């Protein structure tokens, strides 16, 4: 009966049936093989633990994310993510639900084909559709115009949409955030003697990326007050007992979003990719792209944005033009709240790929 | 029919069929040749007396323990231990029982090979398995995680196990206790004029190590109250008639377990080997190694432990972490209660070495 | 007058004035307190012996290396290393020489500050500079491009440099070798019954790490010929009289450099850190990083490298690309031969920290 909205997270895969409030299942997408000798012999141990149990059994496994730089690294682990989610989380049969899957707008072909093809032949869903994650965040936002920011660990994208069409030549992909923000945080916590070399401990770094980080209002003046003796230093507690005190680096790591030079990436910041995508759109349409800048995803939830993002864009943009930055409550579930609206509406249900069409055309003509 | 659990004591060899309550036979493992001229001529005297009769015929023999510093000194005496136990104690035929043998985790190779090989070719058992003594104490404990302490006269070991695998690089071997505690007790009883120079009399020292010793709560303050006129002095009775009054040295000898400098050993105490083995294990796993410290063996049965061990570890360990020291009732039979659980369970019975495999591979591939 | 190049060894501190051939003084960096009771009463004994005399007075002391995991453990012993070297080895006055000190590229802050600050305030040098050990090995190598390997007991590093700039986001630190290779050698010599438990005896293990070890060409086939009766076994002689015969473990211990799983470290081998640091550098620059792989330090002097290192990298690297592994004669003095070239050249002498600047800025602005 009911359609299923399953979002192919970069993080953080999100799953829930059509409507209403939020995804029913969210989990960190990890598969982990056992890296220690089995001498206990109980045995009772699984061949590979998936999440969430692989986030409660850290250090006895070696966590490997299955999606890396926005591409699925191997479909052997990906299929196990899917199977684990459908059977032992959601508890639904594939033959009972038409599904809805997500992708990234600037991702290589035939990665959507191979995906679509494997999911139809392995799980035998009765119908399917694959949406780019940015378009769904417009439905979630409830605006009919604007530039969409889907930023997750680790693929960001910048898609401009105007009432009610998209401009093909204006889409910008930054590989700037967020797994590289995790790795950069791990490199600048070494500056205060906190060395987290192992795979498992890298998750702890990610947890400090959630809770303790913030973004500055003005870099130079936050760097100034960091030099002062005042308490920028916040004390985190670690599962083994250690108390970790981080200062400067706490606001330094997210600031990378405005200066990619810090992480050593040549590309221009969110600051400039916003401006340069708007100034690749037609003159008349720019008037309503200003004041319809819509952020989304989990990596836009740091405290110091959006009024940093606002002040930076407003400084580079032409004088005497109104700029408002639209940032929804609960951006982490934005894409999913999109998907729910889509699959419930008539009539584009009948633009979904159905099994009869798949039998005829296979991976051809997916576009 | 029934499998036999036979524990290769360092002491104190322990033997009993599979299940249930306790080993059927325990004995001090001594062989003794006759050190006096035979002029009685009855004769009727055995070429060498084994225990228990060699502990009732002391002084007419020279007792020689067959396992010394955790290694079997010669298999000529060891084979006589085995033969004596199977035939004139247990009263079982070797061809009727699959056996279960024990070893130490950090013991030289090919001492397990040579053992396995001699026992298969001499006693012709139909199947065999050799377990390290620490792993069996986990089965006895009924916990799935924790650091294991097998301390017997005279090899201790410290093995960390986490659900349900072992960490290879964290095993610590101290040669600190217990035959050196016997020898140290013999050296500090000389301080009160009790000189026990002969081999036989050394057993009497060992008996005073059992009954009269205790461990302090705080060394410095027990040393203080020893200087006081109050009765720390306890009167032991000796088989010849002598009444021996020991004071300070009564709590001094076990304290060596926390300060190896007293016996002149360079290595760090149980205090520090516990901490340093935990801080060689992964950060996430340390959280559940704290509060799963499991003691075992006969030399952990002194009265003043475990709350000395507790207070000392709790002082060196990081602040705000829960530490409980798990010390079973009847630790002297712990290993054996382990072995019983192992050989009764399916399926690792079919990971035992069988005669057909021994015919094919011999001492090769025992690992 | 003349500047002094003093290399802050992890081993093995190296010292010599500016130019020409080799360091004038090399020594094992040990401080040792006396672990036995002083009953001889001559007396004439020093409070603590430093090396070299602490390597001729082993067993009466407890040797403690002052640098542990690449960090200075306490500056009380470090200052005594420095004082001993300058006064009773080199025989130079601190006020007479501008000095040159070394560090590690991925080492916590403020460990270079605290060092610089203590050495300026304690020894009152008229000028100072602190170089990372890898950059100096490029000057020694005489190449203008390439990835630098500084591997000493016990911090390795992997720094890529291209004509004539460095790439910040490509530096990799492995804590894989070499004190852990010493400890691993001590753990696998126990497999042949050679138990070297004490601190002093650990030096003897280190000496067998120098002389008798080798690296395999192909692991699986060297493991095969080890199973054969052919003489891989080499006989070492020990200062007490013992003749030690080691076989398999002789080539097993260095092989850890290609498989960190053996020592239980989660990180990827030199094999993969070489490849993964090159494939984090820009596409155009990789062409000349291939064939400019430059090794350095004392722990790269084992016999079986570099043609193992070559064959392993050449197998993982893309097809049809020339790979040469540059390994200098006398790699143990490489860093120092670097330092000599640096301090002799104009003009970056005037980028050294001078006393006037230290008076003004102190430990601030060392970077």
Residue numbers in the entry:
A (entry chain C), B (entry chain E), C (entry chain D): 5 to 371
What does the paper say about this structure?
As we expected actin conformational changes to be subtle, we obtained a reconstruction of F-actin alone at 5.5 Å (right), as well as a corresponding MDFF model to control for error in micrograph pixel size calibration and differences in processing procedures with previously reported structures. The myosin-bound density maps were then aligned in the reference frame of the actin-alone reconstruction, followed by re-docking of the corresponding MDFF models, a procedure which we found revealed regular patterns of actin protomer rearrangements which were masked when the MDFF models were superimposed based on the Cα coordinates of individual actin subunits (data not shown). Consistent with what has previously been reported for myosin IIC and IE, this flexible loop also shifts upon myosin VI binding, orienting slightly towards the MD. The Cα RMSD between the ADP and rigor states is also of a similar magnitude (0.9 Å), demonstrating that the D-loop adopts distinct conformational states as the myosin force generation cycle proceeds. Unexpectedly, myosin VI engagement shifts the H-plug towards the two actins located on the opposite strand, with an increasing deviation of position from the unbound actin state as the motor proceeds from the ADP state (Cα RMSD 0.9 Å) to rigor (Cα RMSD 1.6 Å). As we observe the conformation of the H-plug becomes increasingly deformed as the motor proceeds from ADP to rigor, with increasing RMSD relative to the ground-state of unbound actin, we speculate that this segment is adopting an increasingly unfavorable conformation as the binding affinity of the actomyosin interface increases, suggesting strain energy may be stored in the filament as the force generation cycle proceeds.
In this study, we focus on the MD of myosin VI, an unconventional myosin motor unique in its ability to walk ‘backwards’ towards actin filament pointed ends. Finally, by comparing the conformation of actin in the myosin VI-bound ADP and rigor state structures to bare filaments, we find that actin structural deformations accompany motor conformational changes during the force-generation cycle.
